[PDB]
Structure formats: structure tokens, C-alpha cells
Amino acid sequence: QNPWIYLNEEEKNQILNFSESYKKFISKFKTEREVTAYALDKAKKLGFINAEEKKNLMPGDKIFYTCREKSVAFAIIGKNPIEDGMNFIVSHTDSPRLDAKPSPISEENELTFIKTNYYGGIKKYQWLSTPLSIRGVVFLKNGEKVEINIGDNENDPVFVIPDILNLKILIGSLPIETKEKNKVKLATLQLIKEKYKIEEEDFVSSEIEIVPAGTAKDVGFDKALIGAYGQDDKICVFTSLESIFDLEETPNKTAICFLVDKEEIDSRYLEYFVSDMIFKIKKSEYNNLHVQKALWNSKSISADVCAAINPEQNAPQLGYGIPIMKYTDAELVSYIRQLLNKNNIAWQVATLGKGGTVAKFLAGYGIRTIDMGPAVISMHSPMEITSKFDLYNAYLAYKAFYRE
């Protein structure tokens, strides 16, 4: 039946606007750090406060916990006793990219490249002959942090990985007049030094990942699809953040909107910040056994999207609802069935062969978890295709959840 049909111009416009926001978003923030900053700055406004500077913890309190520039907390304390449980969302900030080697700069056949190391489920041949953007953090010999972002931006140059007819990013040609060995390497190295104050070796340390350059676009004549890079869960990072973000009024039962990094596969940060909130709530009476009880009650949703079909009644389809995934607790599923149906939110079912890490881990603490995220096409490619209807749909699924 495809949900679109039962909508009206109003709702239809709500979707189209929410999607423009989503675009300006994934278009800008592509790396874990970048997305973290985005998230953080949004909550900084809207009124969220850092965990510290806060010994207090009252219903309606909007706070946030920072991990290490790659993960964030974001919690709005609810009316019910924090002991009776909380609701977590959890989505991963990272996505597949390249990561330059510790000592990446090298010259080959009169050309300078960056070494790089495949990260995530890359589709190799898809990264060949494509505009790339270098993004990184570099600490100098004196631990002075510097930031790079080249590829997007106006007039900005791009970098590629040539092909015929390993993974090395082309950085530059034309030499420098010197009796030194590799001239194109030096030539290029001086540029980077003159422009960034960076010297070779500053590359050890530092964190530099190569990302598909370019901006998100609309797919098809009907502009009903979004093709972009990072769709893998950034659609969830975005939608979940929104749902929790001041788009409500104090909720019964505390709301948590995690956002983890899979590089850190965070693995304990949950225990730490959740036990921190509990201590703020019961000073002289704090106690390990609480938390444990707090966590054991809580229910959580795991974002990470899932694949769809190209070119079965258990595979999802674009623009047909948020799918409730299951890899290959009925009572929790029942809770969401009703919850969604109650609000008239469109959902789907989905079985998967070979997100999972996050589903686990969460359930490892006692939190009853469920897998829910949109559905993607050309997954883990520089252009993952998603539906705008699903985008808004997810945001409604979440939130609706937060407001049980």
C-alpha cells in the first residue's frame, strides 16, 4: 500500500523539511568526531548541561555526558524514580572510511600519495576514481592540535585513488628544485607545512580519515530518496537526537540518547555515566545495587539501519515503515507493536544474515533491547539510498518510544 498514499500536503511538507535538515547535516558532518561535535553543540543550545557543574538531578533536567570526542550521552531526567528504569536509543557515530597509515606520505612514479587503511565494510572498487575528502586531527611535535578538512568547501581540491582499464590517495605532482631524493614528496610536504604547520611525523599520532567528498542529493524524478555517504546509522544518530531533543515536555521515565563509536566497540562508559546519575540522585545513600536495578529495568532501542532489496516477506522495503529487525523477547516486541500501532506509525519486519555489537552489550547490562532503524540500499557505499518517508517515520517511532 506504500504509506505515502494516506498522507496529506501538511504531513507531506513536514517530511520534506525534516529531510532538508537531515541533508545539510550528513552533508556537513561525516566523521565520528564531526558528528559528535554537531550533537554536542545542538544540546549545548536547547539547554543541555554537562554532567559536572551538576550535583543536582531533577525531573526535566537536561544533561549530557562526554566520552572522548567520539561519543556522547544526552539525558533528560524523567518524573519516575530513576530506579524504575530509563529508555536508551544508542546509535553509532562512525561509518566506513579510509584512515591514513601512521607514516602515510610516499612518492611513487613521480606522484605523492597517502597510504590509508580500509575501515568498515568497504566496497573497494567503489572508492576507485571518486572524489575524496581528507579529514583529520593532527598534534604537532609540541602537542599542538590542528584540524584538517579538505575536499568539500568552495574551490577546495579533491583527492582520488586512480584505476587501470594497494589503496593510495593521490596527494600531488610537480616537484621542487632540490638535490633531495623524492622531489614530488618534498614539494607536497612543504605545501602541507606552509598551509598547516604540519611536518612529516606529525602524521604519527594524529587521526586522518579519507571520506567520499561531495554533498547529499535527491534521488529520482520524484525526489523521494536521499543518496548520501554515512547513511549507515547517521540517519539514526540524526533521528534519535531529534526525537529526544527539545521536541517535548518532561517525560515519565528518564530518556537517554547515547551515540556510541564502534571503534571503541563506550564498552563501559554506559556503566560509568549511568551510575553517576544514580549517585547524583542518592548522595549519602548511593549504592552499587541500585544502578544494577536501574539498568535491569530500562528498555533500549538499537539504531543501526539494515539492508533492503534491489536488483521475501521478511525483508524490508524503502518508504514502508521503520523495520523491527531480528538477527538470525516477544514481550518487548509486543510493547513496540502496540506502541507503534497505537500512534499509527508504519513498521516492518526484517531478518538478517550477517548494529549487532550494539544490540549485544546493551542487553549485556540487563537492558531489554530491540533492533530498529530505517532500511538502506547500496549500503556501505559512497551513496547509500534511503527514503524520506522512512527518515521522518524513524523519528516518530523513536520519540513515540521516549514518551511511553
User: Is 290 a known ligand-binding residue?
Assistant: no
Q: Which domains does the chain possess?
A: 1-96+215-404 (3.40.630.10), 97-214 (2.30.250.10)
Non-local (6+) Cβ contacts of 144 within 8 A are: 197
Q: What is the dihedral of CA 10, 16, 17, 20, to 10 degrees?
A: 180
Residue 92 labelled as part of a binding site: yes
Q: Which of 275, 278, 258, 243 is nearest to 66 (CA)?
A: 258
Distance CA 53, CA 84 (A): 25
Resolution (A): 3.2
Helix (H, G, I), strand (E, B) or coil at 352: strand
**Alpha carbon of 166 to those of 31, 76, 113, 212, 292: distances in Å?**
23, 47, 11, 18, 48
SS (HEC) of the chain: CCHHHHCCHHHHHHHHHHHHHHHHHHHHCCCHHHHHHHHHHHHHCCCCEECCCCCCCCCCCEEECECCCCCECCEECCCCCHHHCCEECCCECCCCECCCCCCCCEEECCEEEECCCCECCCCHHHHCCCCEEEEEEEECCCCCEEEEEECCCCCCCCECCCCCCCCCEEEECCCCCCCCCCHHHHHHHHHHHHHHCCCCCCCCCCEEEEEECCCCEEECCCCCEEEECCHHHHHHHHHHHHHHCCCCCCCCCCEECCCECCCCCCCCHHHHHHHHHHHHHCCCCCCCHHHHHHHHHCEEEECCCEECCCCCCCCCCCCCCEEEEEECCHHHHHHHHHHHHHHCCCEEEEEECCCHHHHHHHHHHCCEEEEECCEEECCCCCCEEEEHHHHHHHHHHHHHCCCC
